[PDB]
Amino acid sequence: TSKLLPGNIVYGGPVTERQAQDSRSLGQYILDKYKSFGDRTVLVDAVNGVEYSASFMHKSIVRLAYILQKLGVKQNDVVGLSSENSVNFALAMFAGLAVGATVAPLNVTYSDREVDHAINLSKPKIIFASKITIDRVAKVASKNKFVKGIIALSGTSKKFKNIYDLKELMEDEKFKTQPDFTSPAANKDEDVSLIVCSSGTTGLPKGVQLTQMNLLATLDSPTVIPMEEVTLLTVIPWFHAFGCLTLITTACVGARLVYLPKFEEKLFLSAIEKYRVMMAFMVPPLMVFLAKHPIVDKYDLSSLMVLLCGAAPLSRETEDQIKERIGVPFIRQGYGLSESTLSVLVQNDEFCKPGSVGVLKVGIYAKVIDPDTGKLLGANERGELCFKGDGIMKGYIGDTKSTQTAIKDGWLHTGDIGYYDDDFEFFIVDRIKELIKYKGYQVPPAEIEALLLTNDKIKDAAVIGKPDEEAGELPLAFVVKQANVQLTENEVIQFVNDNASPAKRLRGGVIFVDEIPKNPSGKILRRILREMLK
Numbered sequence: 001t002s003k004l005l006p007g008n009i010v011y012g013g014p015v016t017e018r019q020a021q022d023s024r025s026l027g028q029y030i031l032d033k034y035k036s037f038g039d040r041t042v043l044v045d046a047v048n049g050v051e052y053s054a055s056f057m058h059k060s061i062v063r064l065a066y067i068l069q070k071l072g073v074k075q076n077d078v079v080g081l082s083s084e085n086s087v088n089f090a091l092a093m094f095a096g097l098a099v100g101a102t103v104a105p106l107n108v109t110y111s112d113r114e115v116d117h118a119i120n121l122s123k124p125k126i127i128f129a130s131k132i133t134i135d136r137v138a139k140v141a142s143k144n145k146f147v148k149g150i151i152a153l154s155g156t157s158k159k160f161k162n163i164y165d166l167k168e169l170m171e172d173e174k175f176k177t178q179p180d181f182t183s184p185a186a187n188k189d190e191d192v193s194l195i196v197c198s199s200g201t202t203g204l205p206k207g208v209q210l211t212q213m214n215l216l217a218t219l220d221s222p223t224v225i226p227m228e229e230v231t232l233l234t235v236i237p238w239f240h241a242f243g244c245l246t247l248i249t250t251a252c253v254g255a256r257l258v259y260l261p262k263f264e265e266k267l268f269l270s271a272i273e274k275y276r277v278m279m280a281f282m283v284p285p286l287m288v289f290l291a292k293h294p295i296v297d298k299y300d301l302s303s304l305m306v307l308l309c310g311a312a313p314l315s316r317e318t319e320d321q322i323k324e325r326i327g328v329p330f331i332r333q334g335y336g337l338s339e340s341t342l343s344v345l346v347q348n349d350e351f352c353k354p355g356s357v358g359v360l361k362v363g364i365y366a367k368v369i370d371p372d373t374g375k376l377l378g379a380n381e382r383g384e385l386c387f388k389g390d391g392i393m394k395g396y397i398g399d400t401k402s403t404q405t406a407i408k409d410g411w412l413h414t415g416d417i418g419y420y421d422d423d424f425e426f427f428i429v430d431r432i433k434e435l436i437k438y439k440g441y442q443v444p445p446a447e448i449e450a451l452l453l454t455n456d457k458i459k460d461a462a463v464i465g466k467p468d469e470e471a472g473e474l475p476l477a478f479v480v481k482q483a484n485v486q487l488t489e490n491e492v493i494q495f496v497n498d499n500a501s502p503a504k505r506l507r508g509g510v511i512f513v514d515e516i517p518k519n520p521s522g523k524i525l526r527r528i529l530r531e532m533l534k
């Protein structure tokens with residue numbers, strides 16, 4: 001029930017439920033939820049086929065929570081998490097939240113300098129790490145005195161002084177703990193539950209701080225199905241806000257959360273078939289895969305009911321394609337930023353126009369402002385989207401300048417161009433910083449990208465501005481064709497020439513490639529793309 005308030009501000013409605021917010025801390029709300037689920041399955045390791053009960057989660061969170069306190073972790077301390085999706089990941093995060101510590105997950109594919117830059121943003125006192133990243137993490141922690149200890153969820157290393165094996169700690173008979181642990185009370189308004197590293201044009205990430213309030217208010221907020229009885233698959237990485245908050249919310253609703261370490265084409269399809277996955281979180285890259293890759297037909301996907309996509313531009317042409325190929329009833333697209341905790345806009349049964357991002361979630365205000373002025377725009381006027389509500393981040397840790405630039409008067413200036421129609425359904429056009437500056441025009445690469453993805457001969461597409469002396473930027477398309485097909489640069493140029501405005505002309509040419517660089521969250525790594533121009 002969105003409302004158009006005076007002044008051209010859109011409102012998603014008042015937040016009715018207050019269960020999570022009433023809690024004394026996110027750690028206590030998670031523990032009680034898990035305990036209240038009894039012995040039901042809540043986590044399924046798809047690769048190894050191991051079901052995990054709610055009581056197993058509760059017991060392990062209690063044990064690990066005590067161990068953290070013994071190791072010196074105190075309320076509002078920071079603990080790092082560098083690991084693929086796994087039960088130990090969830091156990092590590094929940095335990096850290098149980099003791100009232102900030103959890104700072106770290107991208108698993110990070111490099112020495114990115115890892116070093118991340119842990120220098122949040123300054124974790126203890127860091128969890130699996131075998132895939134322990135060597136890099138231990139090596140980096142050596143050059144940072146604030147890191148007092150590393151816990152290895154798997155594997156080992158000698159490049160750091162104080163390393164603990166999680167298995168030995170959990171099982172230490174000499175360390176006696178009670179069957180139940182209770183989380184301390186949090187200043188929900190200021191205590192930081194999560195520090196999520198966001199990608200930016202800087203090349204190095206910023207640390208967005210999400211308070212307990214941000215998370216509890218989000219918890220208190222797509223289809224008519226009760227999520228509790230849902231078998232849910234999440235391939236988005238859990239160190240990203242989308243996958244991270246999706247793991248928490250799904251956990252609090254008692255759903256059956258199936259997971260893979262990362263994403264893999266065959267493992268993804270295989271998981272949906274074996275475990276009868278009914279709903280899955282996706283990023284556009286996976287949606288395009290479902291829509292294009294021929295391997296998709298080699299699997300039984302009948303159990304799939306809902307596809308929840310977000311994090312990057314997704315066109316209706318791709319949505320329709322997927323629905324017409326595999327026959328999934330519900331495809332819902334959502335929009336949000338790391339700075340907005342989770343989504344601020346989601347499609348539903350009533351507001352699910354093709355290619356839209358839905359309507360505001362309760363408690364969130366939205367406004368479309370014209371850049372180069374604060375002019376608040378009306379319906380159907382494109383402008384920079386700004387959001388206000390209980391989901392807005394507290395700010396970039398240690399970077400008050402970047403925070404003032406982003407949050408004005410409680411409004412998050414997302415930096416994206418969008419608009420809302422007369423039903424207050426929102427549409428995301430593109431990111432201002434990624435608009436191709438060609439002869440004063442601000443061409444949205446996402447528009448051309450959607451057009452190129454309608455061509456059955458194109459498997460993936462990414463458009464970038466090519467540096468030019470007179471024009472400044474010329475649209476250039478990185479194209480990934482399908483296997484058994486013939487495609488030429490001229491044919492691609494002709495395609496957009498006959499279906500797009502003269503400004504979208506691929507004057508920069510075509511550059512066929514077998515794979516487009518994407519980040520673990522499905523965002524086109526434009527930075528890398530501009531480097532390949534050779």
Ligand SMILES: CCCCCCCC(=O)OP(=O)(O)OC[C@H]1O[C@@H](n2cnc3c(N)ncnc32)[C@H](O)[C@@H]1O
Nearest residue numbers: 242310311312313334335336337338343416428431
């Ligand atoms: C249920 C939905 C859960 C979504 C959570 C993901 C949060 C996240 O993505 O955090 P990030 O900070 O990494 O991304 C922030 C930036 O990503 C771009 N963006 C994000 N969503 C869309 C979209 N639906 N359509 C077009 N663009 C999108 C945009 O430009 C934005 O400013």
